[PDB]
Design a protein around this ligand. Structure first.
Ligand code: NA
Ligand code: NA
Ligand code: NA
Ligand code: NA
Lengths: 409, 204
């Protein structure tokens, strides 16, 4: 507990940019793109107010557009007087991917007609399309093979406080070991994480801070309409924050909270506000109406585990169940606890052979051990139960591919 | 129930079946079969023939049966076992786990075949487990997969009975004869004997 992320002060003008959304649409062979930027304002509307959106490739301006406020008519009562949408044509765009993280810079200027700047906001833009077609997750028209890992925010000394150096160290080690994807298990991350994933090139699953694993049954809160407000906030405010990051390719509704009606509602909310990213969620059997991707945890390659209500089928078998058409990407697989990763090769042989088996996220990146000091003041790695907490679950917090200090297993 | 159409020797295999000038002759082999056997409850599936590639004539005759008799699925293996002329993915000698990616007409692993992008059909092998001589090694592997995968709904072994004929030597004692023993040339050795039983119905 505590104040474990940054505290800051921000000064905005009274007349201000209050929100902006960046979209990139493409023609059939990705040789032409349109950058669409919706900008919202707060404060007093004046006829002399303007928004300029410029796009930059390094130091070279590729496009620019200016418009006064006033959106298109949307219903009987007119449109948004406090909004404007700018559209910029981009020929032969340099496309973003984990392989080549090509980035542009979009600059949003709020100003007056005479050219006096009020304020500016900006973001990194990655020209990429994410879609599921014919049962395959495609990035820029090509089927992904997810070499992923789950990564909690953990430091052996500072706990759940994250820093740039630790983040960069993780990304370098991940990419040096042929990972191209990360799952934010199980919450929105420190804001810098996404910036670094944009720039270094990693596919991100951004996950709402909703886990109710201790509930009996697991969906007791998530099927309760009285908990829909609280859950909606955890999903909506995540999307509102992170929607402009190119590295985020998939939204997740949370983790291990069963499957409730609130999941279906919030699944639809995201599909409505952001059609650019698939939505996934594992709860309630990994293949519910709240997920675009079959995303089981610890389903085996060839071996069925036919649990009541929530079976974990063989991943090869799961794909071809009567009526099933979706891609399968394990949200968690290959539990890396201690001397482990036995049978890891069996997954990858299956991933390569089966088009619709598109990889998964290893559990997990780093051991969640903390440093304690003995009678002599010497450091040692401590797990659950070493701090005096009871009931505890012993060494079950250490399931990482790297030690807490980032030394490889 | 399978139409009397096989053009396996053609190069390519669909040379006749894609030729509209052969549609009349092909149509009669399909239509007159349906007209004869359509009241038999034992017949659950119509087949358009065997090893004749995939031509436009198959598509037309597929549709003819569907219009005339909606009560039975239509299958056909030619042209890669999953063409627009078949309701059932019906390969011959597709293996359980091992892909055989031949150009144009691959024989995928049957488990893999089911979940190819956009694929939804049942898979039943029109021919599998070639029982030529000392054979049927790996038969258990098919049956384990059939039982595990709902949409793997079995197959038809090749085949029932050795196609050997009775010849008599100098003493008048009978012996089982195959291709080449009747002076026939060119012949293909003992490839006519792929049966689970001998010609006299004694089990292998
Ligand atoms: Na794959
Ligand atoms: Na754990
Ligand atoms: Na079956
Ligand atoms: Na034969």
């Amino acid at each position: 507990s505590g104040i474990f992320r940054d505290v800051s002060l921000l000064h905005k003008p009274t007349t201000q940019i209050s929100d902006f959304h960046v979209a990139t649409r493409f023609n059939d062979d990705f040789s032409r793109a349109v950058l669409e930027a919706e900008v919202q304002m707060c404060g007093e509307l004046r006829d002399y107010l303007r928004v300029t959106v410029s796009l930059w490739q390094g130091e070279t301006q590729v496009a620019s557009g200016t418009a006064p406020f006033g959106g298109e008519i949307i219903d009987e009562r007119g449109g948004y007087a406090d909004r404007v949408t700018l559209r910029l044509n981009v020929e032969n765009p340099k496309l973003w991917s984990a392989e080549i993280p090509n980035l542009y810079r979009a600059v949003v200027e709020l100003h007056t007609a005479d050219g006096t700047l009020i304020e500016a906001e900006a973001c990194d833009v990655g020209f990429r399309e994410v879609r599921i077609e014919n049962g395959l997750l495609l990035l820029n028209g090509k089927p992904l093979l997810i070499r992923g890992v789950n990564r909690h925010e953990h430091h052996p000394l500072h706990g759940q406080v994250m820093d740039e150096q630790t983040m960069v160290q993780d990304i370098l080690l991940m990419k040096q070991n042929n990972f191209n994807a990360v799952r934010c298990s199980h919450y929105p991350n420190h804001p810098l994480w996404y910036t670094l994933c944009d720039r270094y090139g990693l596919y991100v699953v951004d996950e709402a801070n909703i886990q109710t694993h201790g509930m009996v049954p697991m969906n007791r809160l998530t099927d309760d309409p009285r908990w829909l407000p609280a859950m909606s906030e955890r999903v909506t405010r995540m999307v509102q924050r992170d929607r402009n990051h190119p590295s985020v390719i998939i939204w997740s509704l949370g983790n291990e909270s069963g499957h409730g009606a609130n999941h279906d509602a919030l699944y639809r909310w995201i599909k409505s506000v952001d059609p650019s990213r698939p939505v996934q969620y594992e709860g309630g059997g990994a293949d519910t109406t709240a997920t675009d991707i079959i995303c089981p945890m610890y389903a085996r390659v060839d071996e069925d585990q036919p649990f009541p209500a929530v079976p974990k089928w063989s991943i090869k078998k799961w794909l071809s169940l009567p009526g099933e058409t979706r891609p399968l990407i394990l949200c968690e697989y290959a539990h890396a606890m201690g001397n482990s990763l036995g049978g890891f090769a069996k997954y990858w042989q299956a991933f390569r052979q089966y088009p619709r088996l598109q990889g998964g996220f290893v559990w997990d990146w780093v051991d969640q051990s903390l440093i304690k000091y003995d009678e002599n003041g010497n450091p040692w790695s401590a797990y659950g139960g070493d701090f005096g907490d009871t009931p505890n679950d012993r060494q079950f917090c250490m399931n990482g591919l790297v030690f807490a200090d980032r030394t490889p297993h």
